[PDB]
Each structure stands twice: as C-alpha cells, then as structure tokens.
Amino acid sequence: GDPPKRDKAVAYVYGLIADPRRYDLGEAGRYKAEEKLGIRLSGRTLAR
Amino acid sequence: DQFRVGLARLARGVRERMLMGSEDSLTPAKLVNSRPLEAAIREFFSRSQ
Amino acid sequence: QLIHKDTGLIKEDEVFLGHIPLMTEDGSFIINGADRVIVSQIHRSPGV
Amino acid sequence: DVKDTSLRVPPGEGGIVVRTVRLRRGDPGVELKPGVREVVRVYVA
Amino acid sequence: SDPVRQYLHEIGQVPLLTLEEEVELARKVEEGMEAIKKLSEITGLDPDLIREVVRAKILGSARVTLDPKTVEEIDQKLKSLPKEHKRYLHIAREGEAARQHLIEANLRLVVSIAKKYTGRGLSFLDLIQEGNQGLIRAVEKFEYKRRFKFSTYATWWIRQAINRAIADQARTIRIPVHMVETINKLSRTARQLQQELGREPTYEEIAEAMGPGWDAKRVEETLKIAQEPVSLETPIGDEKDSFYGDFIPDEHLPSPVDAA
DNA sequence: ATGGTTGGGTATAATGGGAGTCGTCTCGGATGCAGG
DNA sequence: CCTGCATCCGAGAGCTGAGAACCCAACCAT
C-alpha cells in the first residue's frame, strides 16, 4: 500500500537491518555470530 | 539501555527544535530539553519490576 | 558543540542533563528515601 | 468548628516511642507534595 | 485495521495542486462567495440560509433541521430568476465545488502540521480532525488576491485549532484555556530555572522568574490545581490481582454502628 | 463592579506515521483449499 | 458438486494472605 518511492524504500530497508541506530546485535551477539559462522564482522548490524 | 532510550527521546526533541526558530538565536543549551531523560531513569528506578 | 556545516561557527556549552542515581558501597540504591536493589536478568543471548 | 483527626495506635500494636521527626515546608532539601504543610513521623519500638 | 493507514491511503488518493490550479480554485470560491451575498441581498434572505440550502443541493439527498420539502421548495423558488441572476446561482455552485475540492486537496497540509503535536494527551486522528476543522475555517477566510501561498495562511488556522483542542480536551477535569497556558508557562520557566541552577528550583525562584503578581503560595496553588487524577484500576503489587480502589473506603453511607 | 472565563486572530513557505515483537500449549470451532 | 485436511483465531490456564505559542478583546457569574 505504501508508495514505492526509491528513497523511502531505501530509508525503510536501511532502518530495518542496516541502521546502527535501530538494529543492534550486541557485543555478545557479534562474538556469537563470529564464532558460530567462522567469519569476522565489521560492525554489529546485519548489512552495511 | 534505559539511558539510551531517554537519549533517543532527547535527540528526537532536539531535531524537532532544530527544524524551527531563528538559526542565529539557536544555542546548544536552547535545543536540549532534558525532561524525557529524567522520565526514563526515574521510571526505571521506581517502576521497573 | 553546535557547528555550522559551512560557516564553521563553533558554539560550545556545558549542559545540565539531570541526575543519575548513585550505587552505595554495599551495592544498593536510595530511591525516594527507600533502599532498592536492581536484580540481574537472564535472557537468550543475541546471535545466530 | 473543629473535629478530631488525630493519629492513634492501631489495635494489636504499640511499644515505646523512640523517635520523632517533624518536617515543615521550607526546610532545606525538603520537597513536600503540594498542599501538605507538614509531616510528622513517630518511631515506636 | 490500522485506521491511520486507511486515512493516509484515502488522503493520498487525491492528487496535489499547483499554483495555477490553487489560484483558480480560490478565485472560483471567492466568486461563489460574492455570488451568494449578491443573491442574498437581491432576495432579502439570510445568506447563511441560502448557502446551506445551495450546499445541501450540491451534496444531494445523501446528506439528510431543514425538511427536504423545505429545501426543495426554496430551490424551486430560486428558479424564478429571469436572467443575470441564475448566473449567481451557477457561480455559487461552482464556488462550493471549489471549496470542497480545495479542502480535499489540502488535507495533507493538516496531516503534516498535526504529525508534530503527538504525545500531548490527544491521539493522532483527533489532532487530524481538529486540524481539518481549522483548515475548513482557513478556506472560509482565505483571500487569494495577496498572491500568498495557501499554506501560509492555512497553517495559522490549523495550529490554532490544534492548540485549542489540546487545551480543551486533554484533561479529564476541564481547566480553562488561560489557566492551561499559565501552567505551560510555569512549566517552561521551571525547566529553564532547573537548567540554569543545576537542580530543581524552589517555589521562590519560580515566583521571582514569573514576574509581578507571582509568589510561592500562588505557584503552589497552581501546581496543586494542575495535578491529574489517577485510575481506580491501577495495578497494586507485582501480581495481577490488586487494584487501587481496593484501598478506598466509602465515607458517605452510614456504618451499621452509626445507624443504630 | 470585579475577575474569571471564552471566543478570535496571527499572511514567505510548508502537503502520507511510527513503535514494535518476536521463549505456551492446547483445544475447539470457522474456514479456505485440495482432491475425487 | 461432495468430502477431508491443514490454518487461523479466540479463549482458558487452583485457593488464601500481602503489595512542548502568544496576544487581545468581548461576556456572563457572583
């Protein structure tokens, strides 16, 4: 229903999984993800 | 965590006040309304289970 | 500090943000004259 | 034109009065509720 | 569900306006207003009555104090105008349509203004409706000759209506508007005094900063009158089994001991 | 005759919101979908 | 067209004790 504006969609998706002010895996969450997945995370969010 | 929530309210109010008023008369002290911060801390320390 | 993006006019100020309750030497708080304890919370850790 | 609204010992209670505290409006650091002139506390052991 | 999204969808279903379309609509409503006053002076009837009947006809029978026979008979009575007078009727009808269209197009300005008044005792939709009332008032009193944009004059009316609604409906115990603004000014002065002093001000400081005619007893009385009541259903204790009213005795009905 | 209370007005321009909630389990009825 | 079969929603889940604009002018009440 919401109009599919490019910037509005960008802001919504950025806030959902990519905004450090909204999405936050803790330091413990970062450590758990790194040890389970065997990767190195740049930050505490799902995407950059 | 409660402090962070209060700071989020403070920042939201600060942005609201920034998008208003003569930009020449705007000072750091004038933009910040601290009341939600006390609201959050006091609610945590008086009402949290 | 209040900073203009182009002008560079710097306005520095110390702001009173309020009061933070202080933990006593034994580890408790005095809220409205009553002794209180904050109980630690166990929950599921963030991660994958 | 006045009536008794005094504080009395509830049934099954009592003891020895060991402390009394009086707080009035205006004493430094006192923050009373609006309308309340003074508060009296009695500690009984 | 989610009525805010439904209202936003309905409000977005109406397209915006440009400057030319806006000035056209305002000119048409202005000429319609001039037409209804001209007609009222010609026939000698109350302008409000003829405006209401004309708008009732423009809406239709869907909009049911005036019996249908009455408004229909007046409509036929206005069909007795030879010429250069039915033009007044047509201009008035087009002006009413212009009024409707302009209000529908600019309801979004009401939404934009009201979205920054949330969290003050009134829900968002109530704020939107009061802003809509203010927008209708502004459309009524807008003069397009000044070449000013519609929003410039509409914003003041919308904000006035919203502020009046906050002052008049936010509290279960009604407090008059002057006392409401006095309380807000007291709170603002108190917070500035707290910022400057680094602690909660005493009543003396607030009274001093208020100005002449303000002393500690007056600020104490104002603060006592500004308290809002609490709910009888406030949960007491951790478990969900005790309410506040469980601790309130009745002092009106006589006790069995008193009755004897 | 006084305060307390109420109605009206402000003119550059402004035009679709925001918190939230994710660890119960079953059971019974109403219901839409799949097959024949 | 009938039927069965997942799917969704709603309604339950022991007792007692206690715990955030401002201003200006007209107008009824007492």
Measured in angstroms, what separates residue E225's CA from nucleotide F6's C1'? 20
Q: What angle do CA A7, A11, A15 make, to 5 degrees?
A: 170
Q: Which of D27, D23, D28, D25 is nearest to D40 (CA)?
A: D23
Token duo for residue E103: 């209000």
- Partners of residue A1 in chain E, C-beta under 8 Å: 5, 9
Within 13 A of A16's CA, how many CA atoms are on the CB side? 6
CA dihedral A14, A19, A21, A22 (to 10 degrees): 60
Closest CA to E6 of E125, E165, E127: E125
Per the CB < 8 A criterion, the answer to whether A20 and B8 are in contact is no
Name the nearest CA neighbour of E155 among E220, E120, E194, E109.
Answer: E109
DSSP string, E76-145: HHGGG--SSSHHHHHHHHHHHHHHHHHHHHHHHHHHHHHTTS-SSSS-HHHHHHHHHHHHHHHHHT--GG
* Total residues found in chain D within this entry: 45
Among chain B residues, the shortest Cα distance to E194 is held by B34
Q: Does E254 touch chain A (CB under 8 A)?
A: no
Provide the CA E156 to C1' F9 distance, Å, integer: 9
Which nucleotide is closest, CA of E109 to its C1'? F15
| C–E interface: beta-carbon pairs under 8 A | 4
- Residues in reach of strand G, judged by a CB distance below 7 angstroms, are B 13, 33; E 119-120, 156, 159-160, 163, 177-178, 181, 184-185, 187-188, 191, 236-239, 241-242
φ/ψ of residue A24, rounded to 5: -150, 100
Nearest alpha carbon to residue E9 among E124, E111, E103: E111
CA–C1' distance E2–F20 (Å)?
14
**Determination technique for this entry:** cryo-EM
Q: Which chain C residues have a beta carbon less than 8 Å from that of B32?
A: 15, 17
Contact B24, B42 (CB under 8 A): no
Which nucleotide shows the minimum CA-to-C1' distance to residue E22? F15
